[PDB]
Structure 1
Amino acid sequence: ERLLDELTLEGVARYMQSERCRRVICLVGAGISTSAGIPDFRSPSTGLYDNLEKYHLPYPEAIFEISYFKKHPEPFFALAKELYPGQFKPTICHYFMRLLKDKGLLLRCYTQNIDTLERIAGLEQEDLVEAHGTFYTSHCVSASCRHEYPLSWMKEKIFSEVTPKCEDCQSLVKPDIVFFGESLPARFFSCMQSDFLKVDLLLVMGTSLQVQPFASLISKAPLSTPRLLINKEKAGQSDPFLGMIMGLGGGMDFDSKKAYRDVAWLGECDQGCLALAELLGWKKELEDLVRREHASIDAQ
């Protein structure tokens, strides 16, 4: 009944190399972009949540909240200037997901990341669910207008510290990211219902699984589907405690005596992906891909 012969990266690589493993879903968060120079949200001291006091918020989550944004957008746009990536070079982890695409194993990448690195690494719109939107485009917030603006326009407003107003109607222009309180893209639900029927392997990388409904995705997979977490620390566990994110019952079981399908490889995402690629015979392909794409970016 158990699909992994052993609860290890080697077990997952052998499963991946079997014919049952045809459809892989990746679930990724900010941890897969930290080696690209983009700090994450919840790491102590460097993460965003430990760097909010200077914005003088009524509480730290306000800067994520759509109703607060609509009333006082200036903190969000000051933060956006502070965190604007100085360069957009995707990581080994991103290019591993690109290799999964090129080899026909990637059914979908569900990303929480707003930095657009998945696109730059070559995942196309069909391969991707940007579950929490991206900074790539922005829209006027007036339902009667909804004029679109490209990242170059938004970037100029952010760096000039001018609050972005729509050129046609002078309402606020918001990046197409999903704030706390907003609905997720409809693509998220349509793809979820189709993808999680088919998935043979769930790859979870670089996320604390602290945000719903995205974190519910790990429970949408069939109960035999193996789940591999590559992350600096365990996350999404089912162990109940007050303030757990997971609905009760759902969650990962790495360590109980009933554990049967969940693997935690604890370390840096780039190293874990390099180790998995090596076990699969993809290490040189992945290394060459990173080198070539990185040089291509370095030229301009």
Structure 2
Amino acid sequence: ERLLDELTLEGVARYMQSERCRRVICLVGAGISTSAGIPDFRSPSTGLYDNLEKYHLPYPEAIFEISYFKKHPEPFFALAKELYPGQFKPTICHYFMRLLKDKGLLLRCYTQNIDTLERIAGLEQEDLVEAHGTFYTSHCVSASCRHEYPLSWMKEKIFSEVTPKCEDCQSLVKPDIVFFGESLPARFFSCMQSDFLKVDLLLVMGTSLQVQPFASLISKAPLSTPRLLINKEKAGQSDPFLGGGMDFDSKKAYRDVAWLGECDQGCLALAELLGWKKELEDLVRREHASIDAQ
């Protein structure tokens, strides 16, 4: 029916500490990593698209294209040079999902981000669907040779400004990210067909819900699954010209809630209502300290 008392964060917090809320899926995107220094994609100001000028490209959205990459892999590796952050420090929001994992509530984190911050916060591969791949490993692009390289090796080059070539054969080696023109990993489809039968709560954070097929995951849940969006803008509402998106505001709204603000602040507030505020503050502070001693 309508599983939330109210369509607010308080409604979602009460629902979460109830009977019916056992399995939680997170859909996350670049918004949850901006406060760790990793810029946005589509934000007007600091977004990646309004900063692809000095990369001499035929058009902005062309440096994550696979066939252009194998043609000229140098602009992308130059881009990774500029973006590659000094420290890898996951945000409050990342640690919020770690709490969900530790409390037995996280069924899966579906992420569009390539920065590996879900792993450093302590989500394990079983927990994650890296829907656009990852920077954490790299593979030679051949086939005869698909030799896997770690991030430590792929980081020496990029910063030694040397284009990474396989050591066994002499082929290009590419971070395990999914460029445009590539298919999403099989794991994505296998998890989607099973995870969304089960799910009792959808948590969407820091994503504009524009790229597909990732955006459509919100409609894979049963119609009674409450869906909370933490984002600084609303997203996932049907375009009025097309024709199960998000409905926060119509009179037919019954399960979608939009908390508008910083993902870090939305997760602080949700954790506070849940009794986890201190536990969360201690975890972040403990882990940021352990990372600052490296």
User: What range describes the TM-score normalised by the shorter chain of this pair?
Assistant: over 0.9
1:135 partner SS: strand
1:44-59 matches, cutoff 5 A = 44-59=44-59
Query: Per-residue deviation at 1:240?
Result: 2.6
- State the Cα deviation string for residues 1-44 of structure 1 (Å, max 9, x = none): 11111110000111111100100000001111111111111111
Query: Per-residue deviation at 1:257?
Result: 1.3
Instruction: Tell me which residue corresponds to 1:187.
Output: 187
Q: TM-score, normalised by structure 2?
A: 0.98
- State the Cα deviation string for residues 233-285 of structure 1 (Å, max 9, x = none): 011111334xxxxxx57311111111111111000000000000000111111
**How far apart, CA to CA, are the structure 1 residues paired with 2:116 and 2:289?**
19
Unaligned 5+ runs, structure 1: 242-247
2:154 partner SS: helix
1:2 partner SS: coil
Query: Per-residue deviation at 1:121?
Result: 0.3
> Does structure 2 retain, via aligned residues, the 8 Å contact 1:131–1:188?
yes
| Most deviating of 219-228 and 40-49 | 40-49
2:287 partner SS: helix
> Does structure 2 retain, via aligned residues, the 8 Å contact 1:230–1:269?
yes
Query: Per-residue deviation at 1:45?
Result: 2.3
Say if 1:150 and 1:249 are closer, same or farther in 2 by CA, change over 3 A: farther
Say if 1:249 and 1:33 are closer, same or farther in 2 by CA, change over 3 A: farther
**How far apart, CA to CA, are the structure 2 residues paired with 1:57 and 1:79?**
12
**How far apart, CA to CA, are the structure 2 residues paired with 1:159 and 1:3?**
51
- State the Cα deviation string for residues 201-231 of structure 1 (Å, max 9, x = none): 0000011112111111111111110100000
Instruction: Tell me which residue corresponds to 1:168.
Output: 168
1:84 and 2:78 are equivalent in the alignment? no
- State the Cα deviation string for residues 20-76 of structure 1 (Å, max 9, x = none): 010000000111111111111111121111110111111111101111111111110
> Does structure 2 retain, via aligned residues, the 8 Å contact 1:253–1:259?
yes
**How far apart, CA to CA, are the structure 2 residues paired with 1:138 and 1:80?**
14
Say if 1:181 and 1:194 are closer, same or farther in 2 by CA, change over 3 A: same
2:26 partner SS: strand
Instruction: Tell me which residue corresponds to 1:125.
Output: 125
Say if 1:249 and 1:138 are closer, same or farther in 2 by CA, change over 3 A: farther
Q: TM-score, normalised by structure 1?
A: 0.96
**How far apart, CA to CA, are the structure 2 residues paired with 1:193 and 1:100?**
22
**How far apart, CA to CA, are the structure 1 residues paired with 2:228 and 2:213?**
20
Instruction: Tell me which residue corresponds to 2:247.
Output: 253
- State the Cα deviation string for residues 149-199 of structure 1 (Å, max 9, x = none): 111111111011111111111111110001111111111111111110000
Say if 1:233 and 1:137 are closer, same or farther in 2 by CA, change over 3 A: same
Unaligned 5+ runs, structure 2: none
Instruction: Tell me which residue corresponds to 1:177.
Output: 177
**How far apart, CA to CA, are the structure 1 residues paired with 2:31 and 2:174?**
25
**How far apart, CA to CA, are the structure 1 residues paired with 2:50 and 2:239?**
26
1:193 partner SS: helix
Aligned residues: 294
> Does structure 2 retain, via aligned residues, the 8 Å contact 1:137–1:175?
yes
1:93 partner SS: helix
> Does structure 2 retain, via aligned residues, the 8 Å contact 1:238–1:249?
no
